[PDB]
Amino acid sequence: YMGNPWTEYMAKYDIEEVHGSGIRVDLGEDAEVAGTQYRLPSGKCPVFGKGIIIENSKTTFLTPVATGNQYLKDGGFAFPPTEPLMSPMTLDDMRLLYKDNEDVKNLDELTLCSRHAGNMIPDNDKNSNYKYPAVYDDKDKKCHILYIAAQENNGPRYCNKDESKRNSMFCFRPAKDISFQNLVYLSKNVVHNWEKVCPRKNLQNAKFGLWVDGNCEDIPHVNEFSANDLFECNKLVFELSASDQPKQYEQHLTQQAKDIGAGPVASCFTTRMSPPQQICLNSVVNTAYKSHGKGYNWGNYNTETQKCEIFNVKPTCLINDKNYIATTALSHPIEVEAA
């Protein structure tokens, strides 16, 4: 074939190319709102099974952000109610909302959710390119626009883990956790044909390799870790994967906040898509480094020896092996299909 026969199938595993941003923490672009610059998610692939854990809270992150006189920790990350309604929104209501937008009405549910989230422009800057990320719940078929685009915050200086301090900034981190298995984390850039060009399911009886001299050889170096099941391996790969989070702390609070993706304060919005329309929150919100996709994004899970083999070089072929399942940080942590 005068070339690597695996090329078409393996294109979706070139995560620098097809995703192009962090996975664990995605903050791969910057956008301005009225002369202030903010970090925001920019990955082109959906991230299956990713949610945000809020430390020492029973409140889940898809809960609306605290508004009005609510305490910060009694809320989550999601858009609060708006007039007219925007989030959360069922797939069916999204299609109705955009029925007269030709280029949007028939998008697949994930791309539609992303475009829906990206419709609102903070009303302080009509020309802003700031677009909020979203989470789609595949079980409920419901799109949640995220008001908070930050994905990790830690350090006693920058958050407070104490449950009795209700209005102090909470600590949080991204995770693949069974409670998030039906969630899909979506940046503003998710491509319309993700079904074809991005990973989703784990590959049964296959392990990643490199195409060398007309044969598929093992990845030259892998890091082998104990992992009891495939889900645990997917979690380990996710934790090691491309990340746009700062590795250190900035002394100044406002600089650290910017660096972790603190965003604009908006109470009203306009729309990118016709018809032009004002959208306002029901209640105002509580007042209280780029990987470009490079990292340890891939794993070969040995189901016999219970070893997660994690590596940071893009794979270019598959090896048939009934003891292996091939995973990526983008992949769903449970779903599998045959190679």
Author numbering: 105 to 392, 420 to 470
Extract from the study:
A fusion chimera engineered using the HP41 AMA1 sequence was ultimately selected for structural studies based on yield and stability of the recombinant protein. The structure of the Fusion-FD12 protein incorporating residues 105 (2nd residue in the chimera) through 470 including the inserted PfRON2L sequence was determined to 1.55 Å resolution. Clear, contiguous electron density in the apical groove of Fusion-FD12 enabled unambiguous tracing of the entire PfRON2L sequence. Structural analysis revealed that the Fusion-FD12 protein adopts a conserved architecture relative to the structure of the previously observed binary complex with a root mean square deviation (rmsd) of 0.61 Å over 252 Cα positions. Moreover, RON2L in the fusion and binary complex overlay with an rmsd of 0.53 Å over 34 Cα positions. The core interactions between RON2L and AMA1 are retained in Fusion-FD12 including R376 of PfRON2L (R2041 in PfRON2) that docks into a pocket at the end of the PfAMA1 apical groove, and P368 (P2033 in PfRON2) that docks into a pocket formed by Y142, Y234, and Y236. Overall, all the AMA1 loops (1b, c, d, and f) that pack against the C-terminal end of the RON2L sequence are highly conserved (rmsd of 0.21 Å over 76 Cα positions) relative to the binary complex. In contrast, some differences are observed in loops 1e/1a that pack against the N-terminal section of the RON2 sequence. Notably, the sidechain of E136 on loop 1a is displaced by 2.5 Å and no longer forms a hydrogen bond with the sidechain of N233 positioned on loop 1e. The loss of the hydrogen bond may also be responsible for the observed loop displacements, though it should be noted that differences in crystal packing between the fusion structure presented herein and the binary PfAMA1-RON2 structure may also contribute to observed shifts. Furthermore, many of the sidechains on loop 1e adopt different rotameric states with N228, N231 and D229 showing relatively similar displacement (~2.9 Å, 3.1 Å, and 3.4 Å) while K230 (~7.2 Å) and S232 (~6.9 Å) show significantly larger shifts, which may alter epitopes in loop 1e.
